[PDB]
Amino acid sequence: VLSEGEWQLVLHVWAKVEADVAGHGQDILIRLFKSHPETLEKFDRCKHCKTEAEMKASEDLKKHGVTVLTALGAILKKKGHHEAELKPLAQSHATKHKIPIKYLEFISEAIIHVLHSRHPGDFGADAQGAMNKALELFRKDIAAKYKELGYQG
Ligand code: HEM
């Protein structure tokens, strides 16, 4: 459980993300792919991609950064009451994309990195701890759903 004040810190910095969803999504995926190249293997079309400018010019990759942040933003705005939003996400990522929980840890790290880089004034220790708690809860719940679907994380 997060406190109401913790959720408000989460949603405060998320409003900043929403001013430029696509640019934040780009930075988060590029950070993910740099820090953890193996994850890039999960995206058929930019498997070949090599440079940051290639990732930044890529139309696909920008659309997926938006897809991620749109879904996650709706989950965060549910303040933990996200079972209905996690059901389809767990379904696809456990049975079709096969995304282990450690890759969700990786992307949570990249999200926190980008939010700190871009909004330090809105992402001090209080707010970083809140966001970390919120992404931890997301990963915990989706992991339980993975197991329900027969996928061991
Ligand atoms: C906060 C974490 C994430 C969220 C909210 C998220 C959300 C989404 C959504 C909404 C879609 C499109 C609908 C669907 O297929 O379910 C999608 C597709 C996809 N996701 Fe995720 N995702 C996350 C993490 C990841 C990670 C860490 C990876 C790989 C390392 C990944 C790989 C994929 C792939 C390969 C697709 C299909 C892309 C395509 O075929 O165009 N996702 N994701």
Curated annotation (Swiss-Prot):
EC number(s) for this protein?
1.7.-.-, 1.11.1.-
Catalyzed reaction equations: Fe(III)-heme b-[protein] + nitric oxide + H2O = Fe(II)-heme b-[protein] + nitrite + 2 H(+); H2O2 + AH2 = A + 2 H2O
Q: Which GO terms describe its molecular function?
A: heme binding; metal ion binding; nitrite reductase activity; oxygen binding; oxygen carrier activity; peroxidase activity
Name where it's found. Cytoplasm, Sarcoplasm
Q: Reported effect of changing residue 121 to A?
A: In metmyoglobin
Phosphoserine is found on: 3
Task: Write out the residues that bind heme b.
Answer: 93
Q: Main role?
A: Monomeric heme protein which primary function is to store oxygen and facilitate its diffusion within muscle tissues. Reversibly binds oxygen through a pentacoordinated heme iron and enables its timely and efficient release as needed during periods of heightened demand. Depending on the oxidative conditions of tissues and cells, and in addition to its ability to bind oxygen, it also has a nitrite reductase activity whereby it regulates the production of bioactive nitric oxide.
What protein is this chain from? Myoglobin
